[PDB]
Amino acid sequence: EQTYVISAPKIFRVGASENIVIQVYGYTEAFDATISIKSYPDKKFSYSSGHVHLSSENKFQNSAILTIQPKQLPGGQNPVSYVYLEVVSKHFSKSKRMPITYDNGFLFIHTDKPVYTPDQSVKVRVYSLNDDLKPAKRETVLTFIDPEGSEVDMVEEIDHIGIISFPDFKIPSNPRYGMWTIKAKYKEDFSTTGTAYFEVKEYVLPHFSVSIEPEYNFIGYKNFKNFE
Amino acid sequence: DVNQETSDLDPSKSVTRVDDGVASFVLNLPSGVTVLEFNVKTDAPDLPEENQAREGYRAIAYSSLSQSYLYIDWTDNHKALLVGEHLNIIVTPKSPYIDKITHYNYLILSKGKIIHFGTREKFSDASYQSINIPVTQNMVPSSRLLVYYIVTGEQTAELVSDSVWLNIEEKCGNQLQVHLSPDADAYSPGQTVSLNMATGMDSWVALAAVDSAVYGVQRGAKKPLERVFQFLEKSDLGCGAGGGLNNANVFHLAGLTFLTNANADDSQENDEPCKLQKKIEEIAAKYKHSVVKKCCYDGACVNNDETCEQRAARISLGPRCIKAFTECCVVASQLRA
């Protein structure tokens, strides 16, 4: 009685370098195994494959890193929901259906301050990463949205490093105050979505400043009867 | 029970340690235990029974056809997991009846990808067996470990697996640091300050000078610095503290899918998340018209230099606000005498 084990992540990320592990037990001498990925309905399109040779030298365990190239997907804007993973060897063969997603890296939107006043400037930069938490230089497009919800200005910048410094945003003389939204996405094929917020309020000169200090930041059973 | 029989265990009591902040418990359950429900509460001396904290929980048994189960644990107290050290992991495979095993198989994952794999040889004599696992830099944010062995039944082959979640120290690649040459806490206006940046490797740095009062209230002041860790940890596909209902469920809680003979995983149905004036307030609040209530407010504002209707002539909004405005001005003029 002899058996094989194929280990893969639950979902696949496009453009990610994904590690597939093959571990085989109960076999003598050595053999080669091929692990590839195809399209769900038919296996014609093969987005990548790998070849691993397992022996007593290798303890009958091998690893292969598959990658889904983003540009081999359908040019139409309708996504591909499922993808086949195929393992073929001399002694056996097996196939599996597994979903994918276009969420890949991470977009973190760094602003200098959470609050702004009229006629100020918003100093903003973005950090973009891949599945490996590595720079992943990609041209990123971010858009601004006002508290009323309309897209105001849209800007795009290429990535030399992974610290992307976007043009400063000028605040109008008489703006619409409220909670403002900044969205970031990669230009073409990536669905990775970063988001951040910042608030804008009209400045007024206080006649005097008032502070309110409690006894604690929480009300416990002790002070339920009296709170200084 | 599997017979649907409930038994109360003799209650256990412990105390959280000084270092770990964890009260440790161990329950020896009957062999045929299926589901275990337990309530944990605080006995603290100066707190009344009302004001003590309490939380209940439920636990389910791992289901296997071959009566073969597995439990893995990393032995420590005040768990740290320094990088580069050795992780000594105790494996207690035993309560299979069919158990004489060829080998154990290990898989190690971090940040949503498979960083390590291997196999160790089983000693057919002693039961519990230890594995020395190097902790590497691929594991920096956090990592999950999966261990499984196979048993050959007269019916089918069978996989037996268990998983463990591992929180590891946060240690960067570059470990970049910033300092000021006048490291004292006081500073004077216009004082020249030397800024020092030191990294373990060539790296790009970006700074921020943000007034501490920009955050406003001190409690709950969040930056990208604060949200970057947790918002970044979503790269991990798996959730929970480890374990599972069955072998395939252990793998899925680890965030994995497999292709074998013995055990068919169910990934098809798996897509899931996981963890005086009262007279004024009469008309004012009673009309309940969003446009009118304002007309009642500024209707009742004090005006010495013109009459109520003289102020009412400047209303362009229509009579709907005239009827309210005029009344709210009269009441204000009446009640202030």
Q: How many CB atoms lie within 10 A of CB A161?
A: 12
> Distance between CA atoms of A100 and A175, rounded to whole angstroms?
43
> Distance between CA atoms of A83 and A100, rounded to whole angstroms?
7
3-state secondary structure at position A72: helix
Is the Cβ–Cβ distance between B104 and B129 less than 8 Å? yes
B159, B235, B261 ranked by CB distance to A131: nearest = B235
B118, B204, B216 ranked by CB distance to A163: nearest = B204
Is the Cβ–Cβ distance between A6 and A98 less than 8 Å? no
Identity of the amino acid at B202: D
Tokens representing A88 are 């073929």
Q: Which of B66, B139, B258, B263 to mutate to test the interface with A (most CBs of A within 10 A)?
A: B258
Tokens representing B190 are 């216009």
Q: Scanning the structure block, which residue is given the tokens 């009441």?
A: B331
Interface touch B107/A21, C-beta < 8 Å: yes
C-alpha distance from residue B98 to each of A2, B64, B65, B247 (Å): 17, 12, 11, 17
> Distance between CA atoms of B305 and A89, rounded to whole angstroms?
97
For Cα atoms B152, A84, A131, give the angle at the middle one, nearest 5 degrees. 100
CA distance, residue B1 to nearest chain A CA (Å): 33
Through-space distance between the first and last CA atoms of chain B, rounded to whole angstroms:
80
Beta bridge partners of A142: A155, A184
Sheet holding A178-186, edge to edge: A115-116, A193-200, A178-186, A140-145, A151-157
Q: How was this structure determined?
A: X-ray
CA dihedral B200, B205, B209, B210 (to 10 degrees): -100
Q: Which of these, A194, A18, A136, A79, lies nearest to B255 by C-alpha position?
A: A18
Q: Which residues contact B78 (CB under 8 A, 6 or more apart)?
A: B17, B19, B20
> Distance between CA atoms of B211 and B213, rounded to whole angstroms?
5
Q: Which residues contact A224 (CB under 8 A, 6 or more apart)?
A: none
3-state secondary structure at position B229: helix
> Distance between CA atoms of B107 and B146, rounded to whole angstroms?
5
Q: Which of B259, B266, B268 to mutate to test the interface with A (most CBs of A within 10 A)?
A: B259
C-alpha distance from residue B325 to each of B278, B289, B311, B318, B322 (Å): 17, 12, 9, 11, 5
Resolution in Å equals 4.2
Q: Scanning the structure block, which residue is given the tokens 């063969």?
A: A93
Q: Which of these, A144, A120, A124, A125, lies nearest to A201 by C-alpha position?
A: A120
The DSSP secondary-structure symbol of B208 reads: -
CA B196, B200, B204, B205 torsion-angle sign? negative
Question: Which residues in chain B have Cβ-Cβ distances shorter than 8 Å to A34?
Answer: none
C-alpha distance from residue B151 to each of A107, B147, B227 (Å): 46, 14, 45
Through-space distance between the first and last CA atoms of chain A, rounded to whole angstroms:
76
Q: Which of these, B119, B93, B91, lies nearest to B105 by C-alpha position?
A: B119
> Distance between CA atoms of B27 and B40, rounded to whole angstroms?
13
CA B25, B30, B31, B36 torsion-angle sign? negative
Task: Output the furthest CA–CA distance in chain B (Å, rounded).
Answer: 104
Sheet holding B113-121, edge to edge: B113-121, B103-110, B142-152, B157-167
> Distance between CA atoms of A102 and B84, rounded to whole angstroms?
34
> Distance between CA atoms of A175 and B202, rounded to whole angstroms?
43
> Distance between CA atoms of B313 and B187, rounded to whole angstroms?
61
3-state secondary structure B271-332: CCCCCCCHHHHHHHHHHCCHHHHHHHHHHHCCCCCCCHHHHHCCCCCCHHHHHHHHHHHHHH
CA dihedral B116, B119, B122, B126 (to 10 degrees): -10
Q: Which residues contact B119 (CB under 8 A, 6 or more apart)?
A: A23, A59, A60, A61, B103, B104, B105, B106
Interface touch B48/A115, C-beta < 8 Å: no
Is the Cβ–Cβ distance between A24 and A70 less than 8 Å? no
For Cα atoms B223, A114, B203, give the angle at the middle one, nearest 5 degrees. 45
Q: Which of B100, B103, B114 to mutate to test the interface with A (most CBs of A within 10 A)?
A: B114
Identity of the amino acid at A71: K
> Distance between CA atoms of A85 and A215, rounded to whole angstroms?
61
CA B116, B119, B125, B127 torsion-angle sign? positive
Beta bridge partners of A164: A126
C-alpha distance from residue A86 to each of A80, B139, B266 (Å): 17, 29, 17
